[PDB]
């Protein structure tokens, strides 16, 4: 799973600049800047009126690829939210956010979600004391997301927390920047987020 292969190319295609690379898809070159069209022989050609479908499809994939998650798993979360009271949109994102590897990203530790994964699955994160390496782990209210002892001494984590000093975390999230701890504070309300996605079209893609 977890995609692998060409990325700042889905930063493309969707044409709404995904920060998949981390730092590079920030420079003057996610390749999004220098080639602003779809990949392959055509790309730059008379774009044609996309079908309702094409839209709904292209909107869900967008969201899914952000988190980089197998359709299977993505689908699972969707249904979880559907059979649940609350605005299904809101809820869904919460659950998507509440994933460890994404908290790791959204607390800063890691530059990219795909980098944030590798850390997790290498035991470099730890929860409420005890160490964990399961990207799909869903984090709950009041949960210290530290960094394990043998992971505190590493170039990567420093440089990533370096640019985090002083900068702002989600309103539902805290971060002890010194001690590389940090807490999930609540389930993030829809407004807290900023993704380039009309989540309603994703709810509609799955009504088919």
Among 44, 70, 159, 200, binds another protein (CB under 8 A): 200
92 is in an annotated binding site: no
Angstrom distance (rounded) from CA 174 to CA 169:
6
Q: How far is CA 187 from CA 75, 120, 140, 171, in A?
A: 20, 21, 8, 10
Minimum CB separation of residue 6 from RNA in Å reads 4
Verify binding: residue 156, RNA, rule CB under 7 A: yes
Residues 6+ apart with CB under 8 A from 119: 104, 109, 110, 125, 151
Inter-residue contact 124 to 101 (CB < 8 Å): no
89 binds another protein (CB under 8 A): yes
Question: Does 174 participate in binding RNA (rule CB under 7 A)?
Answer: no
117: annotated binding-site residue?
no
Contact with RNA (CB under 7 A): which of 36, 44, 54, 163? 54
Among 17, 24, 181, 186, interactor with RNA by CB under 7 A:
24
Please identify, using beta-carbon distances, which residue of 57 and 87 lies nearer to another protein. 87
Find the shortest distance in angstroms from Cβ 192 to RNA.
27
Per the annotation, does 11 bind a ligand? yes
90 binds another protein (CB under 8 A): yes
Instruction: Measure CA of the first residue to CA of the last residue in the chain; give whole Å.
Output: 25
Cβ-contact 184, 98 below 8 angstroms: yes
Sheet holding 125-127, edge to edge: 130-132, 125-127, 143-147, 183-184
The distance of closest approach from Cβ of residue 88 to another protein in the complex, given in angstroms and rounded to an integer, is 4
Q: Would you list which residues are annotated within the binding site for Zn(2+)?
A: 8, 11, 25, 30
């Amino acid at each position: 799973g977890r995609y692998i292969g060409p990325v700042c190319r889905l930063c493309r295609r969707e044409g709404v600049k995904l920060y998949l690379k981390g730092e590079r898809c920030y420079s003057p070159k996610c390749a999004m800047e220098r080639r602003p069209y779809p990949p392959g022989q055509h790309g730059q050609k008379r774009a044609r009126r996309p079908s309702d479908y094409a839209v709904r499809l292209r909107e869900k994939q967008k969201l899914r690829r952000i988190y980089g998650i197998s359709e299977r798993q993505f689908r699972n979360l969707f249904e979880e939210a559907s059979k649940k009271k609350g605005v299904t949109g809101s809820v869904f994102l919460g659950l998507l956010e509440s994933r460890l590897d994404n908290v790791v990203y959204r607390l800063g530790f890691a530059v990219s979600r795909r980098q944030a994964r590798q850390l997790v699955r290498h035991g470099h994160i730890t929860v409420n004391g005890r160490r964990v390496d399961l990207p799909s782990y869903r984090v709950r209210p009041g949960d210290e997301i530290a960094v394990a002892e043998k992971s505190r001494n590493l170039e990567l984590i420093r440089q990533n927390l370096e640019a985090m000093k002083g900068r702002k975390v989600g309103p539902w999230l805290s971060l002890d920047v010194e001690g590389m701890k940090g807490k999930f504070l609540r389930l993030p309300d829809r407004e807290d987020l900023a993704l380039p996605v009309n989540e309603q079209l994703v709810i509609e893609f799955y009504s088919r």
